């Protein structure tokens, strides 16, 4: 049955969508004199038994000027695909590093079906634990050949899709006081189109398919990701499911939920944000980019929307630091 | 066994690579005043029985000024993945359309393992046949709501990866006189990192893995794509295999082979080009972008290398038109 679902994933993934009507897009043209920055980067093992690696990024000109904040970036996929080394994600981290003038940490995590959830969440904690280990032992000076000054008091987690779900899980784990990693302080979370689930569909989930994503594909992701016998109302998928933490008692750090207007996951992301808003103590900003689909920030690197996301994440970081 | 190979494909695909040493990349920063263009586009069925669609792109400002040449773009994958609607490929076609001031045709084709090769090649011919049908019946005027002037005497095929292989197959089919579609004239072919194969490895194929591609992944592609019992020396994979056409008797239109210096497929692409060069009547240009891996033109849309590829394809089109 896993092999059946695997074959169906391939079919669904590359199936695409058909535009009912004409559409116009706006494309940026040649830029003769372009502005430049170098970004240094390297891979390191963070979990030796599972052979899990992360990539560290450093903006060179900015690193020599001040102590850098940390952005931990968790890639997307459906808990079933994606590597830090993939051009798509690597490119995004290059941008994050230079734009935010920050040290970026981009870990691999175990993917399903081989490693069903909560494998990724365990791995995400191992990344944060690895960072702690590096912070307290001055392993930072051996990250790159030259020196590197890092401010572990200014850490931020940026989550894309399934990485957005991972971000939420960390926030809860820290917020509840379950895990605690001084001198590492996560000051905020950025949930870019977080991968949340539910047995009951939202209106947007029943709406038209995106360029790549369909409701069937998302359902397939959950079938392969969640433990055998679980439903989409499981707390790992649905943060507001029947048996999920209350969250009204948990102290969460400030959160930024970014989503596209034409996303299937839009309604569920807005439900998420505004349920937290109405709860006391929670600072949650919700930003919706009109007429955009999943991954617009990374799928269209040089678009106006992507640039704006980077600016918003930057301001968010300034406000909290 | 197909289900076994499917599970192994997933693992191999998202496995990634580990950098042995530090690396630097150069990233372009914010562009305050950006130059713009609109591109109109639509989907059409070109093969009703298999429900195969293509996407037509039109640069608006350029279409009102002159008759547009045609670029038929065949997407990559490994004959196993990819849709015209995918952001990755859609973005590239937006660029092609505006940069080259051309009408772009981006078809889906049936993918393996469900449809093993030569399914894609049959579908590629159906696209060209569809274009012929449109040209001779003035169906072009009903492509978009407004008018569209197309020069079917100036058609070019741009192939990416597996699409590069498809391009080669069309070139042979036209060149030999097997198929002929007046008033449609394909004046040249662009083979961007064409997906060619061989039982025997090149030096580059034994070299280090790329960000995404590994030799194992490419081998898996062929196992799922080629008919059951075939080897990588089959003519559909290897154009210079033991039982492949001679090509010295076939009249090929001018060809442009573009490849990255750090690609696994580099050596085989260079063998391809220079074997044709040494044969009389063949005009083949070979361009190698140093220290680049597969898909650099599309994976890094706003990079210097990608811009250069677009310029080179443009000059190629001018020279032949």
Task: For chain B, give every domain's residue range.
Answer: 38-320
- CATH classification of A39-320, choosing from 3.40.50.1820, 3.40.50.12780, 3.40.50.2300, 3.90.1170.50? 3.40.50.1820
Tell if the CB–CB gap between B19 and A38 is shorter than 8 Å: no
Phi and psi at A319, nearest 5°, equal -60, -35
> Chain A contact for B136, CB < 8 A?
no
Phi and psi at B237, nearest 5°, equal -95, -50
Residue in B with minimal Cα distance to A28? B36
Write b or e for each residue in A233-261: b if 16 or more Cβ atoms lie within 10 A of its Cβ, otherwise e.
bbbbbbbbbeeeeebeebebbbbbbbbbe
- CA gap B286, B156 in Å, rounded: 17
- CA gap A293, B204 in Å, rounded: 38
How far does A148 lie from chain B, in Å, by closest CA?
14
Stretch (H or E) spanning A137: none
For A125, other C-beta atoms within 10 Å of its C-beta total 19
- In the block, residue with structure tokens 């591109």: B39
Check if the beta carbon of residue A232 is closer than 8 Å to that of residue A288.
no
- What residues contact residue A273 under an 8 Å CB cut-off, 6+ apart? A255, A257, A284, A285, A286
For A43, other C-beta atoms within 10 Å of its C-beta total 21
- CA gap A143, A68 in Å, rounded: 14
Write b or e for each residue in A291-317: b if 16 or more Cβ atoms lie within 10 A of its Cβ, otherwise e.
ebbbbbbbbbbbbebbbebbebbeebb
Give chain B positions within 8 Å (CB) of A19.
41-43, 55, 85
Give chain A positions within 8 Å (CB) of B36.
26-29
- The dihedral over CA atoms of A307, A313, A317, A318, expressed in degrees to the nearest 10, equals 40
- CATH classification of B38-320, choosing from 3.30.160.270, 3.40.50.1400, 3.40.50.1820, 3.90.15.10? 3.40.50.1820
- CA gap A144, B160 in Å, rounded: 36
Pick from B91, B90, B133: which is nearest to B108 by CA?
Answer: B90
Environment class of residue B176 by beta-carbon count within 10 Å: exposed (0-12), middle (13-18) or buried (19+)?
Answer: middle
List the 59-98 stretch of B: residues with Cβ below 8 A of A: 60, 77, 80-88, 90-91, 94-95, 98
Check if the beta carbon of residue B104 is closer than 8 Å to that of residue B73.
yes
Give chain B positions within 8 Å (CB) of A11.
114
Partner residue opposite A27 with nearest CB, options B3, B94, B295: B94
Tell if the CB–CB gap between A27 and B17 is shorter than 8 Å: no
SS3 A301: coil
Q: Which two tokens stand for residue A159?
A: 């989550």
Check if the beta carbon of residue B165 is closer than 8 Å to that of residue B195.
yes
- CA gap A125, A123 in Å, rounded: 5
Half-sphere exposure of B93 (CA within 13 A, CB side): 32
Phi-psi region of A69 (alpha: psi -120 to 50; beta: other; left: phi over 0): beta
Check if the beta carbon of residue B112 is closer than 8 Å to that of residue B224.
yes
- CA gap A189, A89 in Å, rounded: 18
Partner residue opposite B211 with nearest CB, options A11, A90, A293: A90
Pick from B274, B232, B236: which is nearest to B255 by CA?
Answer: B274
Phi-psi region of B316 (alpha: psi -120 to 50; beta: other; left: phi over 0): alpha
DSSP state of A257: E
Give chain A positions within 8 Å (CB) of B94.
25, 27
- CA gap B41, B145 in Å, rounded: 11
DSSP state of A140: G
List the 280-309 stretch of B: residues with Cβ below 8 A of A: 293, 295, 299-302, 304, 307
Stretch (H or E) spanning A128: helix A119-136
Write b or e for each residue in A49-80: b if 16 or more Cβ atoms lie within 10 A of its Cβ, otherwise e.
ebebbbbbbbbeebbeeeebbbbbbbbbbbbb
Strands B186-192 and A150-160: unpaired
- CA gap A205, A265 in Å, rounded: 6
Resolution of the coordinates, Å: 2.5
Stretch (H or E) spanning B289: strand B284-289
* Experimental approach: X-ray
List the 109-128 stretch of B: residues with Cβ below 8 A of A: 111, 114
Strands (E) located in chain A: 23-28, 36-47, 52-59, 68-74, 103-107, 150-160, 186-192, 255-260, 284-289
Strand order in the sheet with B186-192: A23-28, B36-47, B52-59, B103-107, B68-74, B150-160, B186-192, B255-260, B284-289
Stretch (H or E) spanning A317: helix A304-320
Give chain A positions within 8 Å (CB) of B30.
35, 99, 307
Crossing angle for the helix pair A2-13 and B2-13, to the nearest 10 degrees: 60
Check if the beta carbon of residue A275 is closer than 8 Å to that of residue A65.
no
- In the block, residue with structure tokens 């713009």: B36
Tell if the CB–CB gap between A85 and B212 is shorter than 8 Å: yes
Residue A113: asked if its preceding bond is cis (omega within 30°), the reply is yes
Strands (E) located in A171-296: 186-192, 255-260, 284-289
- CA gap B10, A10 in Å, rounded: 9
């Amino acid at each position: 049955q896993v092999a059946e679902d695997c074959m169906g994933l391939l079919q669904l993934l590359s199936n695409g969508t058909v535009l009912r009507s004409e559409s116009i897009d706006l494309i940026t043209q040649q830029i003769p004199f372009k502005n430049n920055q170098t970004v240094l980067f390297k891979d390191s093992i963070y979990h030796k038994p599972n052979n899990l690696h992360l990539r560290l990024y450093k903006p060179i000109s900015a690193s020599n000027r001040t102590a850098l904040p940390v952005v931990v970036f968790f890639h997307g996929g459906g808990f079933c695909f994606g590597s830090r080394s993939w051009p798509h994600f690597h490119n995004f981290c290059l941008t994050l590093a230079s734009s935010l003038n920050a040290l970026v940490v981009s870990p691999d995590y175990r993917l399903a079906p081989e490693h069903r959830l909560p494998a990724a969440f365990e791995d995400a904690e191992a990344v944060l634990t690895w960072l702690w280990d590096q912070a307290v032992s001055d392993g930072v000076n051996h990250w790159f050949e030259d020196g590197t000054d890092v401010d572990f008091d200014r850490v931020f987690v940026v989550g894309d899709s399934s990485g957005g779900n991972i971000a939420h899980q960390l926030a809860v784990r820290f917020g509840s006081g379950s895990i605690e990693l001084t001198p590492v302080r996560v000051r905020g979370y950025v949930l870019m189109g977080p991968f949340f689930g539910g047995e009951e569909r939202t209106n947007s989930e029943n709406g038209p398919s995106e360029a790549l994503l369909s409701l069937d594909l998302l359902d397939k992701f959950w079938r392969l990701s969640l433990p055998n016998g679980a439903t989409r109302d499981h707390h790992m998928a649905n943060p507001f499911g029947p048996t999920s933490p209350t969250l009204e008692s948990i102290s969460l750090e400030p959160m930024l939920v970014i989503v596209g207007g034409s996303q299937l996951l839009r309604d569920r992301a807005k439900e998420y944000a505004y349920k937290l808003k109405k709860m006391g103590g929670k600072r949650v900003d919700y930003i919706e980019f009109e007429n955009k689909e999943h991954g617009f920030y990374s799928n269209y690197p040089s678009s106006e929307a992507a640039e704006q996301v980077l600016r918003i994440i930057g301001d968010f970081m300034n406000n909290l630091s």
